[PDB]
Amino acid sequence: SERRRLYPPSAEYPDLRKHNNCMASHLTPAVYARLCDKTTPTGWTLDQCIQTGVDNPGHPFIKTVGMVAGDEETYEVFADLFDPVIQERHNGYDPRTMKHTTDLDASKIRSGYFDERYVLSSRVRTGRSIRGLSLPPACTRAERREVERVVVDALSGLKGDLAGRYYRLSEMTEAEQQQLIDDHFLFDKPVSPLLTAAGMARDWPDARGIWHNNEKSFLIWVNEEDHTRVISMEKGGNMKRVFERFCRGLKEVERLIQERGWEFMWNERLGYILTCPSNLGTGLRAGVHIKLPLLSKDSRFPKILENLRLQKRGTGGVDTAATGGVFDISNLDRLGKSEVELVQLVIDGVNYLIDCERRLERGQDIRI
Amino acid sequence: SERRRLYPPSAEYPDLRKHNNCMASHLTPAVYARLCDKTTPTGWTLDQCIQTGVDNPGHPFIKTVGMVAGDEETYEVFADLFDPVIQERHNGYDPRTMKHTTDLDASKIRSGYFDERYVLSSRVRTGRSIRGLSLPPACTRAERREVERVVVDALSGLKGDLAGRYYRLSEMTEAEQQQLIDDHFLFDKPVSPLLTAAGMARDWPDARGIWHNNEKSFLIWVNEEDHTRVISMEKGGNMKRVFERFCRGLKEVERLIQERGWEFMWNERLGYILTCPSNLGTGLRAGVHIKLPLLSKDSRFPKILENLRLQKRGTGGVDTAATGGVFDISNLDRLGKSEVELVQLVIDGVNYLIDCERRLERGQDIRI
Amino acid sequence: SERRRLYPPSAEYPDLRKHNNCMASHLTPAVYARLCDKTTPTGWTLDQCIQTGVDNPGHPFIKTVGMVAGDEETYEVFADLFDPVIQERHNGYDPRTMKHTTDLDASKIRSGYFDERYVLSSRVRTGRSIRGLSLPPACTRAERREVERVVVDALSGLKGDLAGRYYRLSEMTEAEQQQLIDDHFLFDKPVSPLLTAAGMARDWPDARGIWHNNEKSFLIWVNEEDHTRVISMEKGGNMKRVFERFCRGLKEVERLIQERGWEFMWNERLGYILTCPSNLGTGLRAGVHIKLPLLSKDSRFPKILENLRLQKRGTGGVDTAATGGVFDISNLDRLGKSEVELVQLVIDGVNYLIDCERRLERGQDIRI
Amino acid sequence: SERRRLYPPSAEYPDLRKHNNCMASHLTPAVYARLCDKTTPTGWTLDQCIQTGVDNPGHPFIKTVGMVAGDEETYEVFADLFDPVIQERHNGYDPRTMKHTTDLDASKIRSGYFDERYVLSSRVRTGRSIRGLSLPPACTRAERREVERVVVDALSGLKGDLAGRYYRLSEMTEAEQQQLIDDHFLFDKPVSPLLTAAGMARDWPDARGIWHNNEKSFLIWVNEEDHTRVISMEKGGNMKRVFERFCRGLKEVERLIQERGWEFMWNERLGYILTCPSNLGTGLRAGVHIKLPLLSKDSRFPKILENLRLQKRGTGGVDTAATGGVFDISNLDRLGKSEVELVQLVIDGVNYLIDCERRLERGQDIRI
Amino acid sequence: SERRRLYPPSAEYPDLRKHNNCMASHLTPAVYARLCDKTTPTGWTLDQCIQTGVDNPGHPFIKTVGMVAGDEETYEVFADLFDPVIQERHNGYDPRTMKHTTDLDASKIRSGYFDERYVLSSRVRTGRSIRGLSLPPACTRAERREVERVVVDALSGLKGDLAGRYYRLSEMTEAEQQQLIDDHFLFDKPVSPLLTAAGMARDWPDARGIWHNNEKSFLIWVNEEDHTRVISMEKGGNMKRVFERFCRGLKEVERLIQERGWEFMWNERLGYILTCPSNLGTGLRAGVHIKLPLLSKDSRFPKILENLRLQKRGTGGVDTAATGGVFDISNLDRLGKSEVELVQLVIDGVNYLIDCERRLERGQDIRI
Ligand SMILES: Nc1ncnc2c1ncn2[C@@H]1O[C@H](COP(=O)(O)OP(=O)(O)O)[C@@H](O)[C@H]1O
Ligand SMILES: Nc1ncnc2c1ncn2[C@@H]1O[C@H](COP(=O)(O)OP(=O)(O)O)[C@@H](O)[C@H]1O
Ligand SMILES: Nc1ncnc2c1ncn2[C@@H]1O[C@H](COP(=O)(O)OP(=O)(O)O)[C@@H](O)[C@H]1O
Ligand SMILES: Nc1ncnc2c1ncn2[C@@H]1O[C@H](COP(=O)(O)OP(=O)(O)O)[C@@H](O)[C@H]1O
Ligand SMILES: Nc1ncnc2c1ncn2[C@@H]1O[C@H](COP(=O)(O)OP(=O)(O)O)[C@@H](O)[C@H]1O
Ligand SMILES: CN(CC(=O)O)C(=N)N
Ligand SMILES: CN(CC(=O)O)C(=N)N
Ligand SMILES: CN(CC(=O)O)C(=N)N
Ligand SMILES: CN(CC(=O)O)C(=N)N
Ligand SMILES: CN(CC(=O)O)C(=N)N
Ligand SMILES: [Mg+2]
Ligand SMILES: [Mg+2]
Ligand SMILES: [Mg+2]
Ligand SMILES: [Mg+2]
Ligand SMILES: [Mg+2]
To answer: Has E317 been labeled as part of a binding site?
Structure first.
């Protein structure tokens, strides 16, 4: 009968009295009640959006957004809650008002060769989603396999230095996977609290893989946390070369993907659409491992990092803790700035941190 | 969204831990859960069926059914709950298995003349509903006005001794209504707990009325608790004449109503459909007021009345209390027996009560 | 078939040729026809809105609105009929044009101490509804129980002077309920014509209760006529202290209710949404009992009360009559004025009344 | 809203207190209420079925059925009312139980030559409906034009003696139409009470016509009262030749119609479906005009005609009255008997009438 | 279940990596994804629109549009893809912005008499569609037969010189059809790649025909590639007479068609709606066969033709190749210019070609 009553929205309201994520900070009964009936065309709902944040009040060693997107329409359907979260997460960028700009030209990255005695590694990463296919939080098995096929067929066309091979996760022995992970190449096993709580570990390891070139300097993760993750690595401090290779490889990958009639999720308001709102815009993370000695001598690190808009994760893995003083330092914000700007910002911040190696002098300037 | 959850049926289950009506006795969580989604074509629901019983755990000075019907389909839609209630209320008659038979022949009711020193009044009543129109618990204003028009137009054709007039309740002064009520002719004001709790007092006194003959021995209540209530009264103990007049007048009224294309609610399983399950079948109540000085001398009355299947109400209605020793004693069951049988049963029971009035002897036989 | 015809709206139009309530005054065939198809999302309809007014043309000893709301959406869905009624009931306030403002500050209400020889009691009351739950006229059993649980859990957090206990109506003996009612604390039994006609007495006494502090100066009625009624009472003429306690207790109750994810029905156009349109806005009634020998000497009372915008009800109960010259005099209008303004208005009116009623002089100024 | 009530079926029940047609005889409130919601796939309803009977209580000089069909499905959808009417109209044939048989063989119809001094004309007629197209009572303009095109294209193939031409009613001058009607060839103007009341005169004379052979002994009415009416006429009493020509022409017409992918409405339970239930089965009417001076000498005619199952219409149509003693005497029943049987029955009845006509003796045997 | 996923639009995107038609040039993944859900009221879809272009990447000896329309609504529903195609196909005409104008006046077309030693034939053609009926790509058998009936009935009214006869394709022997085709009168057999791939050859030769006058100078193709194709032919270079006859015959045909209540597909934005977007606007093709000896001497022919906006097809048939040096040279664009303008343009271009024979001089001016 239509006379039966539904549970009022406040009855479903989550208990966030001890949570410490942006979703919990920006979620109110009014917003929840307003959005609790809406749904994206593929069936994504607000509860599925905020489940990861509800289940994870903490999650060291960083501040978590606590939300994910199930498809492209999510960011538009639930904008009333995503917009404040995006604005807070990206230090003031306002998706409602301003637009995002992207340029990939390493030529404007003049300089950018770190001290080889302090870095030991440099990486540049981005993510990409295929339009028309649900994101990992919501994708079914068929959609995930479709993403894998599209990406593999497109990547088969890479030639020259970028020429490489695809390795299916389900077809590689445990020893090979462990070796790849320990070498910082392959993505870790599905143990991240966000990955599990959001539902991105379903059907593991089906349809996940890694496509890498022979030198293993160019890599592409398929179906780990985004549809694709394009990575350029180098065991050194030559961020300039890493970024140049990353730019050319990304351009080639985009061209080959678009050749087959597939286009990437993208809108000028948000840039490139990805699952975590923290990866919107460029989705670019340019970072470096940093030397164990000397940087072990820092005391007021968090304030300096926050003022430089740099995020510090432990050694390999955001879910891990720094061992021996080695830190993965990268940019914090990815939306509102272009890739060249973000890479230059990372270079400047890391150079500032290096200059702050006061093993011979004293005093830190912080220098907001 | 379709992902929202409804209140489970047990959440709506009434609290009947102190109720004393047949609905409360025969209502169980399984039945409520099974029937809580169903609804009659006009929108009647189980909650509306059992509201009067839920709101009225007590209601002296009789045992109440605690249910009503909103339309003809109710008794079929919610039969899983009405059938046990009907069976218990009508001392074993099983609506599922057996059928109801009706005969209105005042020839086979020989005798039936009480002692004028003990009765002082004799009345015979029945009810009738117009098919296609909602019952008073659920009828809207338009439906009630339609019932009034149909009944008044049909009754305009009564001729001879039965010839009479219609008096609209909204058009009679308070003094006239009080005089009619105090004379036991007109129905009382809408104060009955069943009438109020079931919703039969909505829009009072709109479309309610009384059609009576000049001698006021033949009366018809329009829209009080059933669509029509046909009554034959006589200030005496001559039940034979009262029943003869009642039978002929009822036959004429039925003929005139059917002449215009309207038919009465009726099915051979239940007989004549009325709002209260206690009035099903014949819907016939034949009773007599009883002497004040004499029957005040009874002590074990309730057992004798129950064994004779006679119900005792106070003078001036069921909601009042007997004063001075005058009681309204009528038949208790109306379904499964024919009108002639019920009238003969009432006569036999009243004669037994008169015989038991032994102011000169002692000892009551009870005589189940 | 779709060729079947519906009863035209005028066929359902109520017969209000003798009614004396605002609904009857402002209801016209055009409005009824326009609104007779609409319905709130929960199924509330215009007929259910106006049933109480249709059934009750009179109801001394005050002028009745004759309408109720089944949920929050009602006031918006049937605004074409509620707006004129609200405007007339609240002496000119126009819900369409102007806005409502609320301030609960016991600082700006200086003075407010009556004469102990003329008052004997001072009370301040307000009502509150939980958003997302149907109002008492339309609420089901599950919704009523949900309201009770939310309110009881929230009120369990009151500490200090306000600390108190909840008493369930179904679990208190008749003697205790009678003692509480006779002491002016508990709400009366469900006999009010409005309460019965509107359908607010369904399932009584299930899920109704009273939460009061140890001193019984702070009380909260649960599910009588609104979802909650917050009351602060004191046997004396010290309205200042009563209002201060009322303000602080109300603020604490609102905070505790909102802590659990529930919010009160409220919109700046109408203020706080309640069942009766006469309680909209602040929903605040500040009143005092009156000494028996004294105000019994008044003769032109009604004009003075109307000019002061004060309502006069009998001793305890709007449905009762004044006995021994003891009157419950409170403010008449609740929407368009703030709580401080209403309390000051009540104080000024009562002080004027005390200044009037001259056993040593003669002549009443009326003083519009 | 779904809470609005519909007019109860008895409110729409027709007033048949003075009607004298089979529909009025066999229509009861129960049947009307049961069937008043049903409808054929094309939208035909019971009211449209019985409109002609409701509007025409009388209609001399015969007994009328008072019903029509809007399409093939009607006879199945409203069988609960058509079946008793068909049974009464066709002297006991039971559509529910027995089946209809058809044979068109002019070999087994030996004899059949009336007295040329008494007949002056012999005619044989049948009707046919095209399956998939609404009947004249319900057909739209497009459907009527489709019927006309199908019939004309099929009839263009008639060769030899049957070769003829189509004449469109809208393209023939009033003088030509009057001459054709007065010669008993063309159908009369749309003035029949049945034709007008049922709705078969809509858009007249659009898409109506007559296709006749050069000798005008073979004719086909298009869209007058059935989709097609096949007629074979002759002057004199040579019924055998008329029936032989009728049979061969009908067979050829059926073959040509079926060649184009169209089939006739037909089911073994009812035979050939036509608008009026009186034309079901064979739909065959074989009749003769009869002598003016002579049969004017009959006195007990109606009983003899009824006992012979012969119907007597006036000359120049059913709606006219016999002039000068000339009568159109044909078979009364068309369903349950085969065409050969019906023609033989007509011959036997007319021969009996001739034998009883001779006034040289006295006494009529009636001879049921 | 609603949780099942659909193939993403890019999965259905056609593979056009080697196609050479305007649809392939102007089709992009974004447009396909945007339009792949839409559909005209009759069920036409984008895939059905572009099937012919997808299946035919080449098709000498001209540039093909690669699209067709299934009904009138197509050009509006899929305008996002048809508009750029129309603009490119009609040398800059913008359907979104500008409007189309039509005038058929053979008075303002003075001159127009070619050299009889170079032409040997002149023809003027247009197409017309009946509003409310699906176009040949999507029309069912019933719709095609309806078009045939409407056109034949209308054309039966042609009188005088234009008087002619209809010849049904299914009723003419192979020899007659071959003779008509070889004489350049009848349309070729259904072998055109566009006709087959678009679905215009379904049910061949049902409901196709040719209506021509006795002199065979005025012809009308029924149901070949448009609903109607009106043609005026004449051996020789007297284009003025051909165009005059064409104009008067077209006006008469339009009048006769409109007399019966049928109107032609037409809107001022696009002109006359036809299946191929290359025939929009006037739908007019005025052309001439050209001399074999002399025009065989052309060397830079294609550039001259393109600059003159003239299209060159082989001898009879767009799908055939020029034999012996005889070419069918007509106007290329049909939308944005009026019929008189197009005919004058054709005359000027053909005269320029004649003057460029240069059998006695040297040098071609091209003369854009
Ligand atoms: N500067 C770096 N040098 C080498 N490896 C890195 C660097 N930054 C990240 N990685 C590798 O990336 C993997 C996953 O890191 P994660 O915190 O998930 O980064 P992301 O945000 O790109 O997922 C780790 O196994 C780590 O070894
Ligand atoms: N035997 C009787 N004699 C006189 N009046 C009677 C008798 N029985 C019932 N009544 C009258 O009928 C009225 C209503 O009685 P009630 O118990 O409601 O009857 P019902 O069973 O028809 O509802 C009362 O005012 C009462 O006086
Ligand atoms: N000034 C007062 N002093 C003591 N009790 C009061 C006062 N005003 C109202 N009450 C109590 O409130 C109860 C209900 O009063 P009612 O007319 O319903 O007011 P409300 O409009 O708040 O419901 C009564 O039982 C009465 O005793
Ligand atoms: N035996 C006959 N001879 C000549 N004409 C006849 C004969 N029977 C019928 N008709 C003609 O048929 C026409 C219509 O008759 P009608 O009663 O409508 O027959 P039907 O019921 O078959 O339509 C009349 O004009 C009448 O002249
Ligand atoms: N100038 C012309 N003279 C004679 N016949 C022509 C001429 N132009 C076209 N045709 C005839 O038209 C027929 C079909 O030509 P087609 O290329 O389909 O033109 P359209 O675009 O009008 O269909 C051919 O059989 C051809 O003989
Ligand atoms: C650790 N997280 C969550 C976040 O960035 O807030 C990732 N999206 N990787
Ligand atoms: C008193 N009652 C209730 C009952 O019979 O149970 C009436 N239906 N009158
Ligand atoms: C007495 N009433 C009715 C009214 O205020 O009109 C209450 N709502 N309490
Ligand atoms: C006269 N009628 C009606 C009837 O047969 O009842 C015709 N159907 N022709
Ligand atoms: C040859 N074609 C295709 C085209 O014009 O592109 C025809 N529509 N005739
Ligand atoms: Mg990661
Ligand atoms: Mg009663
Ligand atoms: Mg109250
Ligand atoms: Mg006829
Ligand atoms: Mg062609």
So the answer is: yes
